[PDB]
Write a protein that binds this ligand. Structure first.
Ligand SMILES: *[C@]1(O)CO[C@@H]2[C@H](Cl)CN(C(=O)[C@H](CC(C)C)NC(=O)c3ccc(-c4nc(N5CCN(C)CC5)sc4F)cc3)[C@@H]21
Ligand SMILES: [Cl-]
Ligand SMILES: [Cl-]
Ligand SMILES: [Cl-]
Ligand code: NA
Length: 216
């Protein structure tokens, strides 16, 4: 039976909160967060992986114009690696792909997709695998102004996915079930870069509509 609550931050599987700046690279931060979690799990080492590597090199995506996490995992697989942040640092603008194998810090051997809309499957994946890449509607002002508690807004549109983030856990706060979400808008946003988002409230903000994780 799956745990009632999980928090990968307590297990050392989660790197510090990043800031994607003014680039549409949410998809790359989400992807690297999932990879970071599997690397820790598999090798015992927590290290920052390179979103810039993805932005510059995942040619099926649109760099700062946006992308899909699935495309990112496929690239890392076909490329036979992803660099560390140190080897390929974040610039926040698309540049030419300059992958450096010497800076390779992780590998990927495929990915899996959570069954569409299923929060129970997403819960079990978070428990069984580690941090999961997810897409949400983050367009509401209520989302932007989040500070604490469990975020729920009826105006959220699960058919208008427009942001990629990382589910690092789940639980309950004061009677409200939640997902522990790591955002990529810096430490000053939300609750030190995180938001608790409502769980089992009919797939609020489309949290389980386009979720995936890498195999390592
Ligand atoms: C995040 O940083 C948040 O804000 C930015 C936009 Cl609004 C949304 N976003 C995404 O990256 C978003 C994430 C998903 C998981 C919701 N994806 C997209 O917006 C997105 C995906 C894919 C493409 C895309 N465009 C392509 N082409 C553009 C047009 N030419 C003619 C062809 C190639 S390929 C491709 F995959 C664009 C955006 C960012
Ligand atoms: Cl369960
Ligand atoms: Cl539950
Ligand atoms: Cl360049
Ligand atoms: Na693809």
């Amino acid at each position: 039976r799956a745990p009632d609550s999980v928090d990968y931050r307590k297990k050392g599987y989660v790197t510090p909160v990043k800031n994607q700046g003014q680039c549409g690279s949410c998809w790359a931060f989400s992807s690297v967060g999932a990879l970071e979690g599997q690397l820790k799990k598999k090798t015992g080492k927590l290290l920052n992986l390179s979103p810039q590597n993805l932005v510059d090199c995942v040619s099926e995506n649109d760099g700062c114009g946006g992308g899909y996490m699935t495309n990112a995992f496929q690239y890392v697989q076909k490329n036979r690696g992803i660099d560390s942040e140190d080897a390929y640092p974040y610039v926040g603008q698309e540049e030419s792909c300059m992958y450096n194998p010497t800076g390779k810090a992780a590998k990927c051997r495929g990915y899996r997709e959570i069954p569409e809309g299923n929060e129970k499957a997403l819960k079990r994946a978070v428990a069984r695998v580690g941090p999961v890449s997810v897409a949400i509607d983050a367009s509401l002002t209520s989302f932007q102004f989040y500070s604490k508690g469990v975020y729920y807004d009826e105006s959220c549109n699960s058919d208008n996915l427009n942001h990629a983030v990382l589910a690092v856990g789940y639980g309950i706060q004061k009677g409200n079930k939640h997902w522990i979400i790591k955002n990529s808008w810096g430490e000053n946003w939300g609750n030190k870069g995180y938001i608790l988002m409502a769980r089992n409230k009919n797939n609020a903000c489309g949290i389980a509509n386009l979720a995936s994780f890498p195999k390592m």
